[PDB]
RNA sequence: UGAUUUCUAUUUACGUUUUAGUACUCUGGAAACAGAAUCUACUAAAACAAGGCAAAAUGCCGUGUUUAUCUCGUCAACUGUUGGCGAGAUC
């Protein structure tokens, strides 16, 4: 299962964090710059094509309801478009969006 | 022949070497080579004194030539006399009346002695008398609008009474005019040829130009302009045929600017480096349009923000350091004609003209002789340019080649030099048996590091010769530039540690405990961050910190896996959960992920506001926290290891390049590497090899051994191989297969004291001392003294007292209050002494009473006079000490009533003889050596007299001779020779080898005089000579009886 | 714990001291000046790291760097005994 865990609006795009989590492993992928055309159109098919850091591998958490930033974590298939509405105000608090 | 990991520690006075077995980690050997610290002040003084001798000899020879000329035309004879001739009066009289031969030639000689200045432009700052030389000459010439120099000199002599001084500064043009008018009217009575007048005028207004140099026979001279030019610039280190370029050339400026530009890192959606078109657009639109570039202009050039840009050279304050365009903008502010300013060859020629030529008219004539589109008024404006000096490292050919390679690629000078691997072609490294030491000479390094490199290179040579070719060599260079820079750093370290200690004492007095002393690191980190974690921005209370720190961890921002940076600029006191969620991640790679706290934009705002706040964040730490790069690439690991693990300083860079080139030319596969100092510091700290270093010279070897072990660790783990392949610049095949991941892996591989006890418990070190045998050192003390023979038979030296009208010179009051009989006016002028004592008793409150007297009355002290018309006192002669040892120079002074001597005959060596079973010795002073054309010969007469002084018999079996630091062994005890202390009492001064005697006494807190003096007489069992290798192996010495007299 | 500048060239006006003169002072003195000291100043000539070259010359070297002692010796400078470049050897 792939979760959209954190997002940050930039001048020309979006920084995205995606946790691919199987039964016992959580792999965190950081995409520093995702084009705005892919974000605003929920083109989740183009996640991997963008450059990303090597996945940080850790033990899987029990559930992925809330991260440290309090943002509501959504599944990648639900699209970043809905994430933009989930916590637009919480992202406005910490200067991302 | 066992392969070893050679370790070198290079300092300013020591070269420590450690030989450690390659596959068993045991210590094969360890030693220290010692040498006095080289200093540019000695050469500077020698050069200044050589120039002074040149000036004096030239003036004297000019006077002798005028004398020969006057003897030719019978203006004098070998029977004339000018005892009563005052040259000033006769010189002013020659302008209007007849001069006798005796009156004429005296004025001519007095003119030839002091002839003024040709070019007013060249002048020094040696003016304590507040007067510019140019300004003084201009004021005098303005006073000379309707007067000759003779008239002005004589009228000043008649008005005040002074002629000589800083006011007698004229230019040669005016003296020449006066001499010409004198010859004009004086030609009628004495038969003088026109060619004679021209010869005298020539002898008056002729001086050597700065490009002709010394005449024939001088080893420092030359033949024509080409030879002087080649000598000044010097052959390129790489290209023997092409000479070096000027430091402020156009091509060199552009090369440095593009190096700076290629060192850039920009956080943009495009390539993070700089492309070709962007670089050319920057050069034209920013560099060619502004003199001193700023980060703001280069940022706004390519539509980026200045804050997103990283990796720029910085100044001492925190401003970007970008290469400014010197010649381009110095020319553009005079003419904007594209043909003149753009042509690179024209600007290169202008740079070469302005640098090696300095007088205005020569610059004009040689730019005029550079036939081009150049106008004439532009030459007039360009002549007055300033600040074009220096010689570049490489020639213009290599400059252009590296310029092409820099324009087209993204590499810098370091990367290009590592890539192409061009070899020094001055001395061919192929058919040379040993390491060439002359290659260090061509490098533009200070003589201190130059001497240190020569010593280290010869030590490596001896190690290779006596043990075979090594496998791995590692070299660490000291941080200190000279002793004074070391003292600056030591003073700042003690001051900062004292301030932190006082702050910790204040904190401990606030809360109350000895608990604050153990928390230093954390407490300082917290202090630099106003009690705030950086990952989570949660408040970090200081009371909670003092109570239970275990939840506040000192996390390393960039992982120890790649960064290798353990410095203070790489620690953040944070919550335990943040560190547990960080792991082997960077704050950029962590803060945006799920496991983290508040997002990255808030942290960026906080950290950029803290970096601007009171300088609490270093630039290095600020760049660490905002590393938005993927540390999993090879480029970032390469950058990190090159910066914080390899010595990027130019000196170590050149030493490395030389060693690697010599090893690769002979196809000898040997790997050499250099290591950063802070890393070895962290190693020595966490190993606890020796926390405090006071044992002595042995320390210099120890660290060497340590870094050898360091190299050892970089061979024992397949993961670390990448670092081993970066610290040596050995080509690695995208590999990235083995690695070190958890910072605990760093702690296990590095901190673990593997084979540390064997490095501690070693007690068989070696020491080698340097012997200075060069004669013709400082012979005598420069100042010259007079003597007076008092009623007591002992002779007395007269010291002078200057500057009687300063404010912090209480020496006169000291002399009058302690014992006034030391002054000479006590015995030979008691009335003036009584007046001076009255003034002294008058102004006790002020420090120097005579200054306050002069400031309140406007008249400095006058000698006792019945009509009150006595002269001025400016200096006072007073008695000094006796005359025990002295060099008498009475023969040089005619019919002197007092013996004139100089002090402190400097000793050169001492030869130990054995006469009838008792040891004696003769001290050979530096005066006893005559310098016959690079053949130094000991004066047989003076040496025989010195032998006779000690009543040394002829049958005395000569034992040996000892120069500086030649090891001696007396009574069975071995020492090093500092030198003759008092030859008359048969005493010498020695010292220990493994430690200084001062430190030997400071270890046991002894208060004995920290210097060892031994007496060589019948109270001495034996005297033997011992030397050492350039590695530290002791050896006896065949006397080769009949001590050395000739020195090549 | 916090990133290169060597080598060299030209000239000026100072300063130290000796000698000589002058000024200053102090003895027998109306004076000439006979005379003492060389303290304090001014002017002139000369020496200024000891010295070694060179022969009318815009003359030269002399406080810098390298410096592990001494051997057989090949080939060299030289007013006879040390320097490359090798073979060698150490209480």
Q: Are B770 and B965 in contact (CB under 8 A)?
A: yes
DSSP string, B793-852: SSEEEEEEE--TT-SS--HHHHHHHH-GGGBSHHHH-HHHHHHHHHHHHH--SSSSHHHH
Cβ-contact B963, B969 below 8 angstroms: no
Listed residue (B870, B886, B875) closest to B801, CA to CA: B875
Method: X-ray
User: Per the structure block, which two tokens stand in for A28?
Assistant: 């965190």
User: Helix, strand, or coil here: B788?
Assistant: strand
Rounded to an integer, what distance in angstroms lies between the CA atom of residue B927 and that of residue B936? 11
Rounded to an integer, what distance in angstroms lies between the CA atom of residue B531 and that of residue B538? 9
What are B391's strand-pairing partners?
Answer: B246
Radius of gyration of chain A measured on its C-alpha atoms: 13
Q: How far is B718 from chain A (nearest CA, A)?
A: 21
Q: Do A68 and B589 touch (CB under 8 A)?
A: no
What is the set of active-site residues of B? 9, 556
| Dist CA B982 CA B961 (whole Å) | 17
CA gap B709, B730 in Å, rounded: 20
Resolution for this experimental structure (Å) = 4.2
User: Which CA distances in Å does B675 have to B8, B653, B781?
Assistant: 10, 11, 45
Residues in a beta bridge with B1024: B969
* Chain B residues near residue A73 by CB distance under 8 angstroms: 594
Nucleotide nearest to B36 (CA to C1'): C67
DSSP B984: G
CB B876 within 8 A of CB B824: yes
Instruction: Confirm or reject contact between B600 and chain A (CB < 8 A).
Output: yes
Measured CA B990 to C1' C83 distance, in angstroms: 31
CB contact (8 A) between residue B583 and residue A56: yes
Nearest chain B alpha carbon to A55: B589
Binding residues of B for RNA: 785
Return the sign of the alpha-carbon dihedral for residues B1002, B1003, B1007, B1011: negative
Distance from CA of A37 to the nearest CA of B (A): 14
Instruction: Please name the residue whose C-alpha is nearest to the C1' of nucleotide C36.
Output: B828
Annotated binding site of B: 9, 476, 480, 700, 785
Nucleotide C86: closest residue by CA–C1':
B433
Order of strands, sheet of B987-991, starting from the edge strand that comes earlier in the sequence: B1012-1015, B987-991, B973-982, B967-970, B1023-1028, B1034-1036
Please tell me the distance from the alpha carbon of residue B979 to that of residue B975, in angstroms, as a whole number: 11
Give the count of beta carbons closer than 10 Å to the beta carbon of residue B159.
Answer: 8
B596 vs chain A: nearest CA distance in angstroms?
5
Burial class, B844, CB count within 10 angstroms (exposed 0-12 / middle 13-18 / buried 19+): exposed
Among the partner residues A28, A94, A96, nearest to B594 by beta-carbon distance: A28
Question: Is B630 within 8 Å of A68 when comparing Cβ atoms?
Answer: no
CB atoms within 10 A of CB B470: 20
Closest CA to B237 of B499, B503, B436, B93: B436
Give the nucleotide with minimal C1' distance to the Cα of B571.
Answer: C1
8 Å CB contact between B239 and B425: yes
Return the number of CB contacts < 8 Å for A and B.
Answer: 70
Residue in the block written with tokens 């010189």: B91
Q: Say how many residues make up chain B.
A: 1048
By DSSP bridging, strand B973-982 and strand B967-970 are: antiparallel
Q: Do A56 and B605 touch (CB under 8 A)?
A: no
User: Taking the CA of residue B801 as centre, how many other CA atoms within 13 Å lie in the half-sphere pointing to its CB?
Assistant: 21
Q: Are B815 and B822 in contact (CB under 8 A)?
A: yes
Q: Are B891 and B882 in contact (CB under 8 A)?
A: no
- CB pair distance less than 8 Å for B594 and A30: no
Closest CA relative to residue B675, chosen from B745, B715, B742, B723? B723
Contact A96 B583 (CB under 8 A): no
How far, in whole angstroms, is CA B152 from its chain's centroid? Answer: 46
Whether B649 has its CB under 8 Å from any CB of chain A: the answer is no
- DSSP one-letter code for A46: G
Residue in this structure with the two tokens 């030198």, named with its chain if needed? B979
Task: State which residue has its Cα closest to the C1' atom of C42.
Answer: B161
Please check whether residue B351 is in contact with residue B367, taking contact to mean a CB–CB distance below 8 angstroms. no
For chain A, the maximum distance between any two Cα atoms, rounded to a whole number of angstroms, is 36
Using CA atoms, how far residue B508 sits from B513, B516, B518, B523, B740, in Å, is 6, 6, 11, 12, 41
CA of B236 to C1' of C85 (A): 28
Answer whether B592 touches A (CB < 8 Å).
Answer: yes
- B22: enclosing H helix or E strand: none
Strand C: positions under 7 A of a protein C-beta atom: 1-21, 23-26, 37-53, 56-71, 78-79, 81-83, 85-86, 90-91
Q: Cα dihedral sign for B642, B645, B649, B654?
A: negative
Query: DSSP string covering B722-767, please?
Result: HHHHHTTTPPP-----S---SHHHHIIIIIS-TT-HHHHS----EE
Q: How far apart are CA B365 and CA B360, in angstroms?
A: 9
From chain A, pick out residues whose CB is under 8 angstroms from the CB of B632.
Answer: 53-54
SS3 content of chain A, % helix, strand, coil (to 5): 25, 35, 40
Closest CA to B568 of B516, B628, B528, B613: B528
- Cα–Cα distance between B853 and B1040 in angstroms, integer? 69
Shortest distance, CA B732 to any CA of chain A (angstroms): 21
């Amino acid at each position: 299962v792939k979760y959209i865990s954190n997002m940050s609006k930039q001048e020309k795009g979006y920084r995205v964090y995606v946790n691919v989590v199987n039964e016992d492993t959580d792999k965190g992928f950081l995409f520093p710059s995702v084009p705005k055309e892919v974000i605003e159109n929920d083109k989740i098919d183009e996640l991997f094509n963008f450059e990303h850091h090597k996945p940080y591998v850790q033990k899987a958490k029990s559930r992925y309801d809330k991260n440290g930033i309090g943002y509501k974590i959504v599944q990648l298939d639900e699209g970043f478009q809905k994430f933009i509405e989930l916590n637009k105000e919480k992202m406005k608090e910490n200067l991302d969006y | 022949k066992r392969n070893y990991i050679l370790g070198l520690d290079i300092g300013i006075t020591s070269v420590g070497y450690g030989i450690i077995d390659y596959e068993t980690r045991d210590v094969i050997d360890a030693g220290v080579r010692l040498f006095k610290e080289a200093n540019v002040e000695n050469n500077e003084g020698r050069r200044s004194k050589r120039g002074a001798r040149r000036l004096k000899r030239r003036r004297r020879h000019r006077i002798q030539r005028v004398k020969k000329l006057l003897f030719d035309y019978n203006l004098l004879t070998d029977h004339s006399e000018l005892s009563g001739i005052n040259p000033y009066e006769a010189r002013v009289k020659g302008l209007s009346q007849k001069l006798s031969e005796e009156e004429f030639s005296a004025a001519l000689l007095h003119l030839a002695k002091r002839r003024g200045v040709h070019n007013v432009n060249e002048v020094e700052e040696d003016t304590g008398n507040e007067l510019s030389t140019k300004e003084q000459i201009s004021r005098n010439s303005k006073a000379l609008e309707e007067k000759y120099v003779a008239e002005l000199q004589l009228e000043r002599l008649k008005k005040d009474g002074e002629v000589r001084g800083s006011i007698n500064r004229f230019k040669t043009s005016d003296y020449v005019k006066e001499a010409k008018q004198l010859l004009k009217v004086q030609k009628a009575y004495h038969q003088l040829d026109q060619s004679f007048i021209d010869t005298y005028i020539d002898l008056l207004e002729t001086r050597r130009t700065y490009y002709e140099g010394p005449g024939e026979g001088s080893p420092f001279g030359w033949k024509d302009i080409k030879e002087w030019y080649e000598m000044l610039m010097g052959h390129c280190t790489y290209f023997p045929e092409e000479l070096r370029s000027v430091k402020y050339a156009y091509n060199a400026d552009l090369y440095n600017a593009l190096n700076d530009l290629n060192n850039l890192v920009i956080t943009r959606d495009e390539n993070e480096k700089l492309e070709y078109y962007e670089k050319f657009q920057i050069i034209e639109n920013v560099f060619k349009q502004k003199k001193k570039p700023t980060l703001k202009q280069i940022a706004k050039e390519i539509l980026v923000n200045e804050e997103d840009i990283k990796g720029y050279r910085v100044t001492s304050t925190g401003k970007p350091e970008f290469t400014n365009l010197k010649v381009y903008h110095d020319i553009k502010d005079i003419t904007a004609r594209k043909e003149i300013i753009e042509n690179a060859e024209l600007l290169d020629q202008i740079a070469k003209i302005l640098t090696i030529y300095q007088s205005s008219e020569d610059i004009q004539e040689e730019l005029t002789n550079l036939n081009s589109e150049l106008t004439q008024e532009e030459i007039e404006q360009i002549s007055n340019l300033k600040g074009y000096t220096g010689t570049h490292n490489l020639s213009l050919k290599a400059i252009n080649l590296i310029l092409d390679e820099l324009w087209h690629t993204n590499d810098n000078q370091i990367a290009i030099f590592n890539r192409l691997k061009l070899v020094p072609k001055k001395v061919d490294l192929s058919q040379q048996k040993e390491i060439p030491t002359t290659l260090v000479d061509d490098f533009i390094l200070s003589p201190v590091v130059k001497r240190s490199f020569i010593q280290s290179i010869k030590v490596i040579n001896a190690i290779i010769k006596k043990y075979g070719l090594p496998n791995d060599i590692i070299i660490e260079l000291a941080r200190e530039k000279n002793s004074k820079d070391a003292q600056k750093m030591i003073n700042e370290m003690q001051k900062r540690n004292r301030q932190t200690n006082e702050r910790i004492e204040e904190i401990i007095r606030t809360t109350g405990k000895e608990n604050a002393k153990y928390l230093i690191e954390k407490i300082k980190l917290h202090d630099m961050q106003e009690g705030k974690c950086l990952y989570s921005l949660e408040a970090i209370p200081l009371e909670d910190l003092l109570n239970n720190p275990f939840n506040y961890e000192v996390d390393h921002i960039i992982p120890r896996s790649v960064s290798f940076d353990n410095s203070f600029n790489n620690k953040v006191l944070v919550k335990q959960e943040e560190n547990s969620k960080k792991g082997n991640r960077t704050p950029f790679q962590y803060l945006s992920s799920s496991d983290s706290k508040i997002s990255y934009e808030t942290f960026k705002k906080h950290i950029l506001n803290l970096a601007k706040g009171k300088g609490r964040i270093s630039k290095t730490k600020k760049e660490y926290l905002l590393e938005e790069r993927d540390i999993n690439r090879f480029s970032v690991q390469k950058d990190f290891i090159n910066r914080n693990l390899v010595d990027t300083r130019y000196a170590t860079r050149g030493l490395m390049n030389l060693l690697r080139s010599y090893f690769r030319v002979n196809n000898l596969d040997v790997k050499v590497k250099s290591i950063n100092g802070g890393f070895t510091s962290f190693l020595r700290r966490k190993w606890k090899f020796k926390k405090e270093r006071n044992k002595g010279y042995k320390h210099h070897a120890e660290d060497a051994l340590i870094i050898a072990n360091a190299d050892f660790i970089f061979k024992e783990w397949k993961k670390l191989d990448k670092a081993k392949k970066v610290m040596e610049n050995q080509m690695f095949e995208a590999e990235s297969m083995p690695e070190i991941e958890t910072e605990q892996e760093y702690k296990e591989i590095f901190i673990t004291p593997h084979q540390i006890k064997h490095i501690k418990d070693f007690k068989d070190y070696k020491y080698s001392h340097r012997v200075d045998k060069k004669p013709n050192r400082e012979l005598i003390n420069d100042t010259l003294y007079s003597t007076r023979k008092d009623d007591k038979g002992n002779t007395l030296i007269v010291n002078n007292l200057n500057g009687l009208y300063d404010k912090d010179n209480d020496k006169l009051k000291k002399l009058i209050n302690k014992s006034p009989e030391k002054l000479l006016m006590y015995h030979h002028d008691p009335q003036t002494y009584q007046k001076l004592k009255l003034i002294m008793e008058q102004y006790g409150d002020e420090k120097n009473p005579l200054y306050k007297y002069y400031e309140e009355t406007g008249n400095y002290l006058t000698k006792y006079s019945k009509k009150d018309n006595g002269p001025v006192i400016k200096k006072i002669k007073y008695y000094g000490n006796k005359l025990n040892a002295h060099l008498d120079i009475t023969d040089d002074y005619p019919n002197s009533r007092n013996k004139v001597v100089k002090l402190s005959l400097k000793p050169y060596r001492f030869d130990v003889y054995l006469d009838n079973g008792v040891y004696k010795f003769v001290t050979v002073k530096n005066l006893d050596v005559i310098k016959k054309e690079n053949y130094y010969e000991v004066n047989s007469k003076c040496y025989e007299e010195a032998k006779k002084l000690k009543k040394i018999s002829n049958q005395a079996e000569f034992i040996a001779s000892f120069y500086n630091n030649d090891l001696i062994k007396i009574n069975g005890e071995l020492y090093r020779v500092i030198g003759v202390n008092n030859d008359l009492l048969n005493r010498i001064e020695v010292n220990m080898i493994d430690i200084t005697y001062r430190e030997y006494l400071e270890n046991m807190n002894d208060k004995r005089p920290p210097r060892i003096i031994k007496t060589i007489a019948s109270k001495t069992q034996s005297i033997k000579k011992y030397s050492t290798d350039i590695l530290g192996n002791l050896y006896e010495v065949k006397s080769k009886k009949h001590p050395q007299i000739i020195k090549k």
